[PDB]
Structures are given as structure tokens and as C-alpha cells.
Amino acid sequence: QVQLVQSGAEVKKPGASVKVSCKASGYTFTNYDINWVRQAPGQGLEWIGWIFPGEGSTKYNEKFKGRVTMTRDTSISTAYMELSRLRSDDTAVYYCATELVKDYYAMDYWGQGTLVTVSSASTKGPSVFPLAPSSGTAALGCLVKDYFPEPVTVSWNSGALTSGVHTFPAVLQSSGLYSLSSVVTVPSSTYICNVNHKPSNTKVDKRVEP
Amino acid sequence: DIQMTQSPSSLSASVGDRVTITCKASQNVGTNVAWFQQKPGKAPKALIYSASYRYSGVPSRFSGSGSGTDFTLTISSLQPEDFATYYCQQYNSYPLTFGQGTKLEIKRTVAAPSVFIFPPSDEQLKSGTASVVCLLNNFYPREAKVQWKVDNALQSGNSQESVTEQDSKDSTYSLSSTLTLSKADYEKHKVYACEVTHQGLSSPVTKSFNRG
Ligand SMILES: CCC(=O)N(c1ccccc1)C1(C(=O)OC)CCN(CCC(=O)NCCN)CC1
């Protein structure tokens, strides 16, 4: 079964470079171009280029001429995308993709996506602050403030409270750190938000109380 | 570059509705147009190539049409797993270019936002910062507006907002507008209020408190 596996997420500082890889299995690797597309947070799709693994020939979007290099390693069925002189807008999920025609159907195959975070910030766990209720139903939550990089997870009551929960998409503050709020509704008649930040190993259960 | 322009950027429909979505190229591109579907947090799934030919596994209710500069994607009977964003793309000339998305959302009855207000926590004031949060829970449609006031001085900047996706059980939206200021500036003012305006409300609604 055709599969394309991408390298793991990365954080880079402005001006650095990143080399994302895309390993192909399940088909003849030298017969089909590998295409790279990116999507910045909340935006659309932008095309970077393709490389033909048969001959190593390339074509790039002019918007990246001089910053992007695409190479192949046929022996291990891997295509690479190296983006140099990284800037803040370069923050996006990067996808590799190919398209084949077996049987008689054209089929498309995609990687799982590689998050490239360009930021002068450094890894930091979040500080969790309670959002206590203030007098038929009550609302409460947690303010997960000042963490880097993404992502942070929030659960309530160790996973028992899934109903009426709204965890908001994170916002990037001018300080380069992320923050999101997570809220829940409960009748006016305990409650603990479980916050975990894998990049900093920060795990904080905070009980909310009025 | 060839510009691909999609319209509308969003649309509210219902299951069974017949949805039509357009895509226009700044130059004639023959039949070399593709359509993609994408779910949030997932890679795109290719739907159409050569303007009208479906990819493997793409249900027949997805049909493509067009030639030259005007193109169309048609969903004959909208099914619940079809709510997603849809991109067209040309590949007649380089660089390959996409249009912006056409997000396809669930229509439902108007809902007024339940407005709540939270003060900065003491754990946060001991830390030296101040974060006040205005919550807008369960409303429809997505469009809304929140405005802050400290001692009835209208606030500009140092306030950011985040809107969740359509709830899986009631298709409603929720918003969090977060206003952030110095502990010094927070103590220096008395009453705080956030004004919420939403077409499901007959007049502006305001929740407020007094500390600092
Ligand atoms: C970056 C997006 C993109 O543009 N593409 C793409 C799409 C999905 C997955 C991977 C690549 C294609 C491209 O690069 O354009 C030439 C890949 C080839 N299809 C040709 C379809 C066809 O006609 N197939 C049958 C021919 N016998 C046109 C689009």
C-alpha cells in the first residue's frame, strides 16, 4: 500500500534552514514527481515545487527561488525539501505528495505534514490560571498562557468531562508566545483542567473553584 | 502568476442541499484544473482532475465542470462528511496556483450568544500580569463583534480573539476575546465591561465588573 512518511516537526530561528524529508514506499519511486505544498496557520495552500526522482530535475515556485533546494536519494526512496533563510511567514505545515495511475484510476498520495515553526522564542511551558464562575448555568474555564511552541492539550476531570467543553484555537501574541483559553459550562450547582505541553514536558492539573 | 479566485469564501448549507462553487482563472487554462477537499488538521484529498474527472474513491455526487477561465464544483446532495473547505487549482502554467478556500458550513437557526465575563485571577496578579476574558458561548451565525471598555473608555489594541469551529452537537460557534494589560494599569482603573453585538440580539449586550 503506497505510503509517504515525512520527517518530524521542527522549530527554527529566523535566518536558519530546514530540511524536510518524505520517504516513499509501495510504488516505483523514480517514476513520479514528488510535490511540496505548504499551509500557514489559518491560510490556504501554496505550492513550493516538485522534483523528478528519475533524473533529479526540479521546478520551483519563483517566490522561493534561491531559498529552496529539493534533492532525492533513490537508494532509500526519499525526497528532501530544504528551505533556507527562514522568516516568520514561513511558519506552516509542509506536505509532500505524489499522484499515480494504477488500474485505471488516478490516485493521490499525501504525507502526514511537517510543522516548521520559525521563531526567536524558546521552549516554555504555560502558566495555567483559573477562570472561576461569578454567579441558570455557570461558566468556568482555564487560561493557558505563554507557552512555546505548539501544541498544548487541555482536558477536564482527567477525561471524564467531554460535554459542554470549548477549547479555543491558540493565539500568537506579539511576544512570540502562544495562549489559549478553554471553557466549560456547568449548572450553578469538582472540576480540574488537565494541561500538558509535550515540547516542555509541562503537565499542570489545576482545579477551578469560585 | 495566474490568479485563481473562488466565490463565495464561505457558504451555509444543509444536508441534501445542492451546493455549487465557482473558480475563475485570470488567464485561459484549458481544462487543467484540479479541486481539493481539506479538513482542519488534515492534508488535502484530491477530488477532481482535468476539470471534470474524479479521483479514485471520490463519490459520484462530486462533479466538476468548466473550461478556459470559468470552472465549477457541484455537490449533488450534500452529506454530513462533506462540510469542509474546497480549493481549486490550475496546472496549465507555472507557478502552480491555488485559489483561497471555499469553506462549507452547516446552516442552522439563529442563536443569541451567552455572554460571560471573567476577571484576572489572583494567581496571575501575584505574577504581575492581568488577563480579562469575555466569553461568547453558543451563537449562530459566526459573525459577531466584541468591544472592551475600562471606565467607559473604549479600548483599542491589546485585545485578541479566537473562535472555535462549529460544535459537533449543535453546530454553534463560541468566541473568546482576551484583553491583556499591565497589573499597574489594571489597578489604575475601576470598572471593566465587554460589549457583545450579534444579529441574534435586539440591542448590544454588556457584561461587566468592578475591581482593581
Ligand atoms: C501540488 C499539486 C499538483 O499540482 N498536482 C498534484 C496533486 C495531488 C497529489 C500530487 C500532485 C498535479 C501537478 O503537479 O500537475 C501536473 C499532479 C498531476 N496531476 C495530473 C492529473 C492527471 O491527469 N492524471 C492522469 C494522467 N494519465 C495534475 C496535478
CATH code, domain carrying B165: 2.60.40.10
Q: At which of B106, B141, B163 does a domain end?
A: B106
| Residue whose entry in the numeric block shows the C-alpha cell 498562557 | A145
* Residues A154 and A194: beta-carbon distance below 8 Å: yes
Residue A144: strand pairing partners: A128, A180
CA-CA-CA-CA torsion for A182, A188, A191, A194, nearest 10 degrees?
-10
Question: Given its phi and psi angles, is residue A146 left (phi above 0), alpha (psi -120 to 50 degrees) or beta?
Answer: left
Are A42 and A110 contained in the same domain? Answer: yes
Chain B hits for A185, Cβ within 8 Å: 137
Peptide bond before residue A151 is cis, with ω within 30 degrees of 0: yes
Q: Mind giving me the DSSP string for A78-100?
A: EEEEEE-S--GGG-EEEEEEEEE
Phi, psi of B80 (to 5 degrees): -60, -30
* Domain that includes residue A139, residue range: 127-208
B88/B160 same-domain check: no
* Long-range contacts of residues A55-63, Cβ cutoff 8 Å, at least 24 apart: A59/B94, A61/B94, A61/B95, A61/B96, A62/B95, A63/B95
CA distances from B86 to A182, B23, B76, B104 (A): 29, 10, 15, 8
Give the pairing of strands A114-118 and A10-12: parallel
d(CA B187, CA B196): 24
Residue with cell 476539470: B51
Asked if residue A117 lies in contact with residue A10, where contact means CB atoms within 8 angstroms, the answer is yes
Q: How many residues does chain A have?
A: 210
Same domain, A19 and A104: yes
Is B96 close to ligand 1, i.e. is its CB under 6 Å away? yes
Ligand 1 pocket check for A37: Cβ under 6 Å? yes
CB-based contact B64:B54 (threshold 8 Å): yes
Cα distances from A169 to residues A144, A178, B85, B172, in angstroms, run 11, 10, 18, 15
Q: Are residues B120 and B88 in the same domain?
A: no
Shared domain check, A164 and A108 = no
User: CB distance B161–A171 less than 8 Å?
Assistant: yes
Q: What is the tally of structural domains in chain A?
A: 2
Q: Which of B44, B49, B131 is the closest to A143 by Cβ?
A: B131
Q: Is the dihedral of CA A156, A159, A165, A169 positive or negative?
A: positive
From A89, A118, A147, the end of a domain falls on A118
Ligand 1 atom at minimal distance to the Cα of residue B49:
21
- Measuring CA to CA, which residue among B159, B102, B163 is closest to residue B133? B159
**Contact yes or no for B201/B141 (Cβ under 8 A):** no
Task: Look at chain B and count its residues.
Answer: 212
Q: Which of B4, B132, B13 is nearest to A129 (CA)?
A: B132
* B residues 134-193 lying closer than 8 A (beta carbon) to A: 135, 137, 160-164, 167, 174, 176, 178, 180
User: Among B106, B140, B167, where does a domain finish?
Assistant: B106
Residue A87 C-alpha to ligand 1 middle, in angstroms?
Answer: 29
| CATH number of the domain within which A142 lies | 2.60.40.10
Is the Cβ of B45 closer than 8 Å to some Cβ of chain A?
A: yes
Pair A26, A100 in one domain: yes
Helix (H, G, I), strand (E, B) or coil at B206: strand
| Chain A residues close to B55, C-beta within 8 Å | 105-108
The Cα A72–Cα B72 span in angstroms is 37
**Beta pairing, strands A178-187 & A171-172:** antiparallel
* Cα separation, B54 vs B90, whole angstroms: 16
Whether residue A110 sits in one domain with residue A17: yes
Which of A2, A4, A35 should be mutated for ligand 1, with most atoms under 8 A from CB? A35
Among residues A67, A98, A118, which one ends one of the domains?
A: A118
Hunting for cell 478556459 — which residue is that?
A: B68
Cell of A74: 533513490
Q: Do B122 and B86 share a structural domain?
A: no
Spatial separation of the C-alpha atoms in residues B83 and B38, rounded to whole Å: 9
Rounded Cα gap, residues B117 and A189, in angstroms: 19
DSSP three-state, residue A201: coil
Residues B77 and B55 in one domain: yes
Identify the burial level of A166 via C-beta atoms within 10 angstroms of its C-beta, where 0-12 means exposed, 13-18 middle and 19 or more buried.
Answer: buried
Say whether both A74 and A33 belong to one domain.
yes
Max CA pair span of chain A? 70
Mark whether B22 and B102 lie in a shared domain.
yes
On chain B, the residues whose CB falls within 8 A of the CB of A168 are 162-164, 174, 176
- Candidates A61, A130, A168; nearest CB to B95: A61
Which of B53, B95, B178 has the CB atom closest to A181's CB atom?
Answer: B178
Q: How many CA atoms lie within 13 A of A206 on its CB side?
A: 24
Query: How many whole angstroms separate alpha carbon B149 and alpha carbon A22?
Result: 51
Residues B206 and B127 in one domain: yes
User: Do A103 and A141 reside in the same domain of the chain?
Assistant: no
Q: Which residue of B has its CA nearest to A165?
A: B167
Sign of the CA dihedral with B136 first, then B85, A178, and A205 last: positive
B21 and B83 assigned to the same domain: yes
CA neighbor of A180 nearest in space, from B174, B72, B13: B174
Domain identity same for B121 and B99: no
For residues B100 and B8, state if they share a domain: yes
**Rounded CA separation A46/B103 (Å):** 17
Closest to B148 in 3D by CA, of B132, B136, B164:
B132
Q: Are A51 and A57 in contact (CB under 8 A)?
A: yes
Q: DSSP per residue over B19-87, as a string?
A: EEEEEEESS--TT-EEEEEE-TTS--EEEEETTTEEPTT--TTEEEEEETTEEEEEESS--GGG-SEEE
- Could you tell me if B17 and B57 lie in one domain? yes
Task: Map grid coordinates 474555564 to a residue.
Answer: A141
> Do residue B101 and residue B128 come from a single domain?
no
Same domain, A9 and A75: yes
Q: Are residues B40 and B118 in the same domain?
A: no
CA atoms of A191 and A184, how far apart (whole Å): 10
Range of the domain at B52: 4-106
Domain count for chain B, please give it: 2
**Bridge partners for A147 per DSSP:** A178
Tell me, yes or no, whether A7 and A111 share the same domain. Answer: yes
Tell me which residue of B29, B32, B57 sits closest to B45, measured CA to CA.
Answer: B57
d(CA B136, CA B143): 12
How was it solved? X-ray
What residues of chain B, 80 to 139, have a C-beta less than 8 Å from chain A?
87, 89, 94-101, 114, 116-121, 123-124, 127, 129, 131, 133, 135, 137
Identify the domain boundary among A118, A143, A175. A118
Interface mutation vs chain B, best among A38, A95, A101, A168, most B CBs within 10 Å: A168
Helix (H) or strand (E) holding A162: none
Boundary residue ending a domain (B60, B87, B106):
B106
**In a 10 Å sphere around its CB, with 0-12 CB exposed, 13-18 middle and 19+ buried, how is residue A187 labelled?**
exposed
